[PDB]
Amino acid sequence: MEQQNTLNDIKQTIVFNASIQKVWSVVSTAEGIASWFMPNDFVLEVGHEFHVQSPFGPSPCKVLEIDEPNHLSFSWDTDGWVVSFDLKDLGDNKTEFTLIHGGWKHPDEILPKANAKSSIIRDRMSGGWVAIVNEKLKKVVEG
Template identity: 35%
Template sequence: MGKDVSLDFEFKSAIEQVWVALTDSNTLAKWMLFQENDFKPIVGHNFQFRTEPNQWWDGIVHCEVLEVDEPHRLSYTWVSGGENTTVTWILKQVDDGTTHVHLDQTGFKEEQAFSGALYGWQSMANHLEKVLTD
């Protein structure tokens, strides 16, 4: 059975600000490890995250938006390198103005892809925190 990435983050930002960071194409490009994307928060929209290719990977993640429940839930497919997974973001506003963010990426078959995703999301969350505080 495959492994799933499951991570929790706390950001000292309003839920609406975090939602924009997850759904605005220009803001996504500031914190994700991908320089380009054509994301739109519309169910059924096909999009790509793109970065420089290397000898092991073409640098493209193919995606489709599955669910948009602004500002609480966002889900999309993530197809890359032979892996077909689903990314789901769940946001909850905490009383002190902090936003709790839960991330799941499910459906990994390969340990290397799982490990890379786990590392990548943790790294990108640090960049997201910086974008939210700028």
Template identity: 30%
Template sequence: MNAGKPSEASPDALEFEYDLAEPPEKVWRALTVPELLAAWMMPNDIRPEIGNRFVFAGTEAAIECEILDAEPERLLRYSWREQPGDDARQDTLDSVVTFTLARTVSGGTRLRIVHDGFAGKAMPAVAMAGAGCRLSLGLHGRAKPVAANLPNTLLLAA
């Protein structure tokens, strides 16, 4: 399955697309440099190399990930395995996150984010994720509101 293509994402995928002024090099750094990624997500030890396993230090439990695909400044895909953080939720959340970057005519980036297999199992976590992450790129009215864990620090820090 290629979650980076809209036609192949599952029905329970969360999908977002944005046109960003920043070039793909800067967006790639924000997604793959541990300190920059931690500024808007969670502490982590990511290395964008296929097969590399890394962990996000979640608030309730660690989120175990593995790099499934990495093409610098073009594509980053990793598995997302979240163990239940409380006794009420018994199922493990196994999903895949895909970031697709494409240079725009103006030199910016068209960023597509797909979190496949997430929404159907984790609707309570959707609210938690929104509350736990800063959700603004500081677009100041020039585009639609930004969601899906894209904070101002994602690009400012890179």
């Protein structure tokens, strides 16, 4: 019939037993995130950039947009990636979580530092993200 084109944005749609407020709290803190991301001093500020502590080198970030009552966006420095966490108010103490992580466009290009097929990192990152999304995060929200 047809095949997919371009690089799809790592989408992770899942429904947790929490509220958009709680789910947001998991994606609007320093300790909460660090509980499923990395040790850093998160900063809820627009155009605010920080630095995290990774065992594989420091990786700063830069907030793009801030909207607790919806979602937020931020870029990834020393890498060239973007991770945005969407939130949907479902109710009944439930909320829809959608992890969107892109960076590349066409399946072929290559980024520095990493230097590897974007499609490879997409799966590599997606996988770990999938688990993390259904490993710590879940434990974070549920916890």
